[PDB]
């Protein structure tokens, strides 16, 4: 454990598999250890900016929060995890990716994606592939979280700054549970429900309760867990999904119905929860995304009327159109995270009556263009939004007037 594991792909035993020389280190951390405990922790306050508007606005993830990503087949769970990892380029957070039971080709593609975006400057990639023995897959997430706890307790020098915040992604805890079930059944341990051993809730819990947010007495560092669970035909009530759902603080449900309907992040806002909530958000996002949450809930209440909106009254059609524009806004391309200032500006433009003129199929394009505008014509607006994002009354007249002027200038000079 330490600084030497940064940009290295390693075995669960710590041996490198990237072929870039031996791992340089001076300290070894044990695989299994007790969680920090009762008085060690602190309330989650610092946000983890995943870059996805829907996640960062509706399902906040904070430093020290265990947020499960639960989906089915190909819904973008690894895409969401990689987008979250890529968004920590200058956020002072060290990412860890475990990849239990995956392909060697899939892990190679993930590592290539990380290193083509510069993310390997702060990322550790543990790897226990499918061909490797079930023992390595069983000990992989614990090796990853041991490295994460080294980052949390001591910290590493990242970009010349001491970093004590770690974000760990267990990219398949369903595969980890499958590997441990194979281990237990080959040891002739008595099976339980779905042939999983009795200590399979214990299994993951030791792994996940180690992700903490320590107080200033114990260093102030944090370890953020992003477990990934693959369901079968959206069977949320299966054994391992219920175990991880009960353990984790919040859930991010990805639906194949939304994925095949064009929703690029296939996020189900209705059932997905983050019980940390507004404490894991910036004050700007807290002030802006409340109306987004309310309008999206209203649209989900009226989703059956979407194709019939031309035959309804004025207020219901207005609610349906607003919900459709907001849902089109949440669609994001892969490997394109957005900073918190860009998300706040876009959601302020959408929350106020500014996207009503632009039609629904262009909303996404509008967003992109607006960001380019804010990236070229008005960097001062982005800096102003980022500067007072922690203000309790975030829409101060200065930043409010600057953002309104930027939105009006963009809308007047563009046609859709």
């Amino acid at each position: 454990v330490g600084q030497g594991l940064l940009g290295r792909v390693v075995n669960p035993l710590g041996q490198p598999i990237d072929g870039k020389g031996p791992i340089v280190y001076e300290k070894t951390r044990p695989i299994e250890r007790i969680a920090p405990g009762v008085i060690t922790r602190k309330s989650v306050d610092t946000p983890v900016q995943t870059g996805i508007i829907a996640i960062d606005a509706l399902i906040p993830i904070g430093r020290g929060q265990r947020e499960l990503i639960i989906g089915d087949r190909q819904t973008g769970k690894t895409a969401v995890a990689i987008d979250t990892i890529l968004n920590q380029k200058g956020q002072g957070m060290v990412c860890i990716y475990v990849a239990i039971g995956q392909r060697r080709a899939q892990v190679a593609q993930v590592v290539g994606t990380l290193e083509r975006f510069g993310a390997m400057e702060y990322t550790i990639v543990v790897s226990a592939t499918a061909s490797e023995s079930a023992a390595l897959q069983y000990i992989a997430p614990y090796a990853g979280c041991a490295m994460g706890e080294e980052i949390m307790e001591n910290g590493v020098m990242l970009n010349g700054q001491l970093v004590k915040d770690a974000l760990i992604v267990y990219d398949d805890l369903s595969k980890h549970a499958v590997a441990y079930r194979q281990v237990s059944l080959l040891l002739r341990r008595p099976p339980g429900r779905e042939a999983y051993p009795g200590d399979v809730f214990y299994l993951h819990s030791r792994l996940l309760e180690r992700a903490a947010r320590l107080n200033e007495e114990y260093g102030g560092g944090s370890l953020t867990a992003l477990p990934v669970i693959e369901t079968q035909a959206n069977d949320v009530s299966a054994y391992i999904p219920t175990n991880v759902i009960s353990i984790t603080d919040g859930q991010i449900y990805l639906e194949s119905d939304l994925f095949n309907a064009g929703q690029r992040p296939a996020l189900n806002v209705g059932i997905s929860v983050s019980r940390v909530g507004g404490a894991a958000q910036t004050r700007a996002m807290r002030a802006v995304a409340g109306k987004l949450k309310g309008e999206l809930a209203q649209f989900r209440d009226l989703a059956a009327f979407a194709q019939f909106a031309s035959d309804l009254d004025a207020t219901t059609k207005a609610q349906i159109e607003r919900g459709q524009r907001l849902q089109e806004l949440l669609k994001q391309p892969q490997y394109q995270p957005l900073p918190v200032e860009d998300q706040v500006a876009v959601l302020y433009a959408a929350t106020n009556n500014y996207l009503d003129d632009v039609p629904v199929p262009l909303i996404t394009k509008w967003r992109d263009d607006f960001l380019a505008f804010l990236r070229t014509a008005h960097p001062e607006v982005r800096k102003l939004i980022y500067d007072n994002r922690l203000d309790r009354k975030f829409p101060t007249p200065e930043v409010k007037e600057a953002l309104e002027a930027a939105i009006k200038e963009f809308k007047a000079t563009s046609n859709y």
């Binding site: 008595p190 339980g192 429900r193 051993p197 200590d199 809730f201 214990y202 009530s237």
Partner: protein, 235 residues
């Protein structure tokens, strides 16, 4: 808690998740090699629940009231863990996410919350008339809500518009700020007694609140806070 029960005190034990107690028992039984029962559960589920929730009784010396929180797997109330929990329950308080989305912190569904003690001869004769009529009015509102949302309140006749108004008033009136927890919408402490609840809901049920708009009843007190705020705002 049984120590303080032995001193004659009235302890109120809280249990964070009795279903996780059930799951711990099931995992322990699986680890001991015992044969599984029902939905993969432990064979000793009934006895394990009995050895815990039969110590929660009203002894002649002292008493232990308890409040569990139950996780219902797959929303299946016939699942063996909720089935065995329900055998020992004396009251249920159902929280709904729909009520929570309407910014109602005590998101208690009065049409889904039951209690065995809700009897005329135990909690009071007026208790099992006020509670019964409040539940009837709320059930009428639940029946008429789809019609109101589809058509509107103009189609509703008399004795139904008034019923819907009173139902909305009580539904918004069930909310409390929980000013003891943090200070969200803080106000002077009330701790509304049972008799005060009965009197306030009998007052509103017998009219006396129709002039109040359906926005004052929010984090209010004992329907005297409601009229006090009504007089303060505009009267």
């Amino acid at each position: 808690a049984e120590y303080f029960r032995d001193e004659g005190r009235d302890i109120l034990l809280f249990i964070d998740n009795i279903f996780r107690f059930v799951q711990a028992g099931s995992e322990v039984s699986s680890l001991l090699g015992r044969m599984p029962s029902q939905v993969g559960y432990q064979p000793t589920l009934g006895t394990e629940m009995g050895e815990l929730q039969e110590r929660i009784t009203s002894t002649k010396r002292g008493s232990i009231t308890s409040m569990q929180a139950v996780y219902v797997p797959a929303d299946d109330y016939t699942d063996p863990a909720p089935a065995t929990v329900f055998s020992h329950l004396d009251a249920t308080i159902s929280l709904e996410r729909s009520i929570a989305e309407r910014a109602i912190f005590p998101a208690v569904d009065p049409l889904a919350s039951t209690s065995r003690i809700l009897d005329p001869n135990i909690v009071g004769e007026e208790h099992y008339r006020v509670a019964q009529e409040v539940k009837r009015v709320l059930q009428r509102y639940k029946d008429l809500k789809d019609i109101i949302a589809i058509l509107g309140m103009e189609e509703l006749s008399d004795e139904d518009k008034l019923t819907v108004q009173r139902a909305r008033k009580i539904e918004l009136f069930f909310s409390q700020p929980f000013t003891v927890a943090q200070q969200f919408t803080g106000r002077p402490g009330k701790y509304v007694p049972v008799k005060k609840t009965v009197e306030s809901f009998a007052r509103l049920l017998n009219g006396e609140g129709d002039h109040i708009p359906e926005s004052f009843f929010y984090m209010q007190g004992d329907f005297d806070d409601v009229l006090a705020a009504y007089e303060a705002s505009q009267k």
